[PDB]
Structure 1
Amino acid sequence: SAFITFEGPEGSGKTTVINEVYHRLVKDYDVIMTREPGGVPTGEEIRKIVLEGNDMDIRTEAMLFAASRREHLVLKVIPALKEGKVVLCDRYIDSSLAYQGYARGIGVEEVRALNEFAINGLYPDLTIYLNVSAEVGRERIIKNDQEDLKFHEKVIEGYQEIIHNQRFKSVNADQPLENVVEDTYQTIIKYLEKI
């Protein structure tokens, strides 16, 4: 079994990368693709509260992302890992650290303590960080507003901080998407072939 998370800002090619890597890994592994809340009923109800939120307090929002994360982990991820699956998970603890911790300004250490309560030591085996520059990410976002640009920059600064302070494998996401996919696939295969 392997619990592989994928992290990055928007415009990092993360959607293309996880989907193409899934289509390649499925030939050899029992693999699933998921994202929180991932169809888990309690998580889905929590997601409704977050998305129906009118100017929700940022700490309440962080605690709801954390509760959705625990439900998804306990009812979807852990059962799949027990079946020996390779779990490809789009966003996990590091998204809360970059978005709630850094970009929203709650503080990375405070959001870490919250998320460590939520995951109770179940950190990923491998975390792919799609390392995109703010400028390349901006162009992909436009294809797919000073405040929006500044928020995108802060998310990237937050990710740069989290990795500055073992499971992380940084992939150059400024390359064309074909190369980002190949490098991510090779990084995952190298890990899985080591058990």
Structure 2
Amino acid sequence: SAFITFEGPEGSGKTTVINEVYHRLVKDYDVIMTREPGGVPTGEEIRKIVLEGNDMDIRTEAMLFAASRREHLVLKVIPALKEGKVVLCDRYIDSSLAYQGYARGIGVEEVRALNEFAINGLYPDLTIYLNVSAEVGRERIIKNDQEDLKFHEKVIEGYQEIIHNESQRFKSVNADQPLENVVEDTYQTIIKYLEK
């Protein structure tokens, strides 16, 4: 079994990459695509709070993302891994570190301590980082304001810091290239890991 997470800001081609890689992996592996809360009842209710929430305190929001993460991990991810599945998970711990920790200003290590409580040692076996420049990412967003532009840059800066410190499970894919190549590089990286 394998627990593979996908990380990157918006405009990184993440949705296209997961769907295309899923279609290629299904030939050889029992594979699933998922994202938090991913249909888990408690997680869905938490997501309703987050999405109905107005001016929510950033720490409360971080704790809700971590609570939906745990529900999705315990009721979806772990049973799938137990079945021998390759789990392709859209966003996990690193999204909270880059968005809540870095971009929102809580502190990466403070958001890490929170998410280590939530995942309780269950780190991904492999994490694909779709390394897009802010400029290409910004262009893909308009295809698919000032505060939004700067928040997007801060998210990327956050991801740079996370990938700088930890580089074992992390595999950076050049997401500035056309999506066909981003898909191919992501596919080859996954196969190399799975076949090892």
Q: State the TM-score, normalizing by the size of structure 1.
A: 0.99
Secondary structure of 2:187's counterpart equals helix
Residue matched to 2:176: 174
Give the Å deviation of 1:18. Answer: 0.2
1:8, distance to aligned residue in structure 2 (A):
0.1
Structure 1: distance between partners of 2:8 and 2:121: 22
- How big is the shift at 1:154? 0.2
Encode CA deviations 1:22-65: one digit per residue, 9 max, x unaligned.
00000000000000000000000000000000110000000000
CA distance in 2, matches of 1:121, 1:179: 33
Q: State how far apart, in whole Å, the 2-side matches of 1:82 and 1:67 are.
A: 22
State the Cα deviation string for residues 146-193 of structure 1 (Å, max 9, x = none): 100000000000000001000000000000000000000000000000
SS at match of 1:127: strand
Give the match's secondary structure for 1:9.
Answer: coil
Gaps in structure 1 of 5+ consecutive residues: none
Partners of 2:134 and 2:47 in 1: how far apart?
Answer: 28
Cα separation, 2, equivalents of 1:169 and 1:145:
31
Report Cα offsets for 1:109-128 as digits up to 9, x if no partner: 00000000000000000000
Post-superposition shift, 1:100? 0.2
Task: Work out which of the residue numbers 173, 188, 191 in structure 2 matches 1:189.
Answer: 191
SS in 2 for 1:67: helix
Alignment of 1:6-45 (within 5 A): 6-45=6-45
Task: Kindly provide the CA deviation profile for residues 88-111 of structure 1, in whole angstroms up to 9, marking residues without a partner as x.
Answer: 000000000000000000000000
Percent sequence identity is: 100
In 1, the alpha carbon distance for the partners of 2:32 and 2:144 equals 25
Indicate whether 1:89 and 2:98 are aligned.
no
Secondary structure in 2 matching 1:130: strand
Write the distance in 1 (CA, Å) between the matches of 2:50 and 2:5. Answer: 22
Q: Which runs of 5+ in 2 are unaligned?
A: none
Supply the distance in 2 between the matched residues of 1:144 and 1:32 (Cα, whole angstroms).
Answer: 24
What is the CA–CA distance in structure 2 between the aligned matches of 1:14 and 1:180, rounded to whole Å? 9
Tell me the distance in 1 between the aligned counterparts of 2:144 and 2:106.
29
Mapped to 1, the partners of 2:66 and 2:92 lie a distance apart of 9
Q: In the aligned structure 1, how far is the partner of 2:127 from the partner of 2:67?
A: 21
Q: Distance in 1 between matches of 2:75 and 2:137?
A: 33
C-alpha distance in structure 1 between counterparts of 2:109 and 2:193, whole Å:
29
